[PDB]
Amino acid sequence: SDLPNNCLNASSLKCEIKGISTYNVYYQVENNGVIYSCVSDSAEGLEKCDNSLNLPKRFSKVPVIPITKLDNKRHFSVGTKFFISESLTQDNYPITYNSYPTNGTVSLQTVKLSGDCKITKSNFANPYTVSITSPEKIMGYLIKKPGENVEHKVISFSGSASITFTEEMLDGEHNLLCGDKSAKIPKTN
Amino acid sequence: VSDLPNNCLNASSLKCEIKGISTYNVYYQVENNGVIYSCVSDSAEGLEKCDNSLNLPKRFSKVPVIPITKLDNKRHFSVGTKFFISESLTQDNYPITYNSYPTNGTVSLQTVKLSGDCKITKSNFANPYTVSITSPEKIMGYLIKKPGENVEHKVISFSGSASITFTEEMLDGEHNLLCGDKSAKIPKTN
Ligand SMILES: *[C@@H]1O[C@H](CO)[C@@H](O)[C@H](O)[C@H]1NC(C)=O
Ligand SMILES: *[C@@H]1O[C@H](CO)[C@@H](O)[C@H](O)[C@H]1NC(C)=O
Numbered sequence: 001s002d003l004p005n006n007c008l009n010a011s012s013l014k015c016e017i018k019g020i021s022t023y024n025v026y027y028q029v030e031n032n033g034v035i036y037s038c039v040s041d042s043a044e045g046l047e048k049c050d051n052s053l054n055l056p057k058r059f060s061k062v063p064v065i066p067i068t069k070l071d072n073k074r075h076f077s078v079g080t081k082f083f084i085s086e087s088l089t090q091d092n093y094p095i096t097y098n099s100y101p102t103n104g105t106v107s108l109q110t111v112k113l114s115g116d117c118k119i120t121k122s123n124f125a126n127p128y129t130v131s132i133t134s135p136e137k138i139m140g141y142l143i144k145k146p147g148e149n150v151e152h153k154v155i156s157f158s159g160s161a162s163i164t165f166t167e168e169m170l171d172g173e174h175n176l177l178c179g180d181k182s183a184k185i186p187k188t189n
Numbered sequence: 190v191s192d193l194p195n196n197c198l199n200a201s202s203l204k205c206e207i208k209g210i211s212t213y214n215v216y217y218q219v220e221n222n223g224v225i226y227s228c229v230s231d232s233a234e235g236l237e238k239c240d241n242s243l244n245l246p247k248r249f250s251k252v253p254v255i256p257i258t259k260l261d262n263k264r265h266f267s268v269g270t271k272f273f274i275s276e277s278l279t280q281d282n283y284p285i286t287y288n289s290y291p292t293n294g295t296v297s298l299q300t301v302k303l304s305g306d307c308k309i310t311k312s313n314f315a316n317p318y319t320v321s322i323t324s325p326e327k328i329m330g331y332l333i334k335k336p337g338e339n340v341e342h343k344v345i346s347f348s349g350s351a352s353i354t355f356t357e358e359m360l361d362g363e364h365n366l367l368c369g370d371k372s373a374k375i376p377k378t379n
């Protein structure tokens with residue numbers, strides 16, 4: 001069969017997850033001798049798969065893209081995700097990515113939020129409240145001091161949302177990441 | 190030794206082996222003194238005496254480019270392959286210098302698409318089939334490509350603004366104007 005019709009019956013057939021990232025899972029399955037490598041953004045039906053212990057109930061579906069400038073990582077990182085990459089030894093295996101089949105290998109890269117998100121200053125609430133709006137179905141934001149471990153703090157929102165800043169965020173170091181954007185949260189005493 | 194990029198840049202004197210060559214960077218490892226340094230660079234200079242240097246490009250293109258995330262858009266936006274640094278699935282990372290910047294991740298090769306800010310506009314002068322691309326970046330690329338066409342090493346780099354006159358062979362409905370983060374279908378016309 002085709003992997004994108006075979007990698008979905010994980011519950012049915014013997015499966016084994018190989019890697020759990022911040023935003024998708026890499027698992028394979030065995031259907032009558034054949035082995036099917038594949039990656040998905042949905043944890044539905046991967047509990048009878050071997051190595052499911054650290055699997056989250058849900059995977060954040062925000063828009064994410066790999067980070068290419070290694071300096072930007074400490075500031076823009078919001079976790080890791082799995083991606084299809086070309087094999088260096090010219091031996092790509094067949095792997096299905098989010099129900100899309102292709103030949104390649106699987107690699108885990110650090111990622112950053114991406115997409116169109118507009119960040120304005122609110123008027124209804126206190127001076128430390130902002131209004132983030134995005135045209136895409138689901139957009140992620142994250143308040144992060146550069147170098148913090150807050151990979152699961154990525155909040156998702158459809159349409160618009162509002163964020164009142166807390167005092168611990170109000171030092172000049174914290175930055176608001178929303179898709180392609182990064183705004184400094186001003187220091188105010 | 191503590192500063193890794195120095196042995197990386199001194200490959201011409203050391204024993205270097207090219208481990209891979211993409212469309213825009215080269216992956217090579219050097220051994221200064223019984224210690225192997227893994228390395229990725231965009232300058233083919235100093236690697237000619239490395240092993241597996243036969244297909245080394247004369248020079249590499251500097252146009253901004255990023256990995257293709259939606260594998261369905263690969264056939265359309267592909268501009269070649271480029272090496273990037275990633276993490277190890279077995280959690281066995283090893284130090285690697287990327288464009289003179291040192292880190293502990295592993296090396297991956299990924300089909301890549303043009304990126305950057307590029308503005309496509311009508312020329313309003315001369316031939317009707319003439320368009321103008323505008324980019325504020327120092328370096329920006331553009332490439333007329335048939336969804337599928339193998340035009341990897343034929344991407345034109347333009348600083349500031351540039352103008353391109355559509356050839357008649359390119360004026361069928363099977364061609365896109367690729368420039369930075371933008372793609373625009375050229376018209377099937379006669
Ligand atoms: C289980 O796999 C079958 C192929 O046998 C495919 O139709 C589908 O992905 C799964 N079942 C259903 C009812 O969708
Ligand atoms: C993998 O490559 C083979 C040829 O080597 C090709 O026939 C096959 O279609 C490719 N896999 C997919 C999912 O297209």
Ligand SMILES: *[C@@H]1O[C@H](CO)[C@@H](O)[C@H](O)[C@H]1NC(C)=O
Nearest residue numbers: 195196198199200201202203
């Ligand atoms: C590169 O190698 C030379 C020896 O040829 C050595 O002096 C040093 O490691 C490098 N060159 C410098 C630092 O000028």
Ligand SMILES: *[C@@H]1O[C@H](CO)[C@@H](O)[C@H](O)[C@H]1NC(C)=O
Nearest residue numbers: 191193284285291292293294
């Ligand atoms: C990561 O690499 C740097 C230099 O490449 C090194 O200083 C550091 O110790 C490495 N990390 C670990 C956990 O060893």
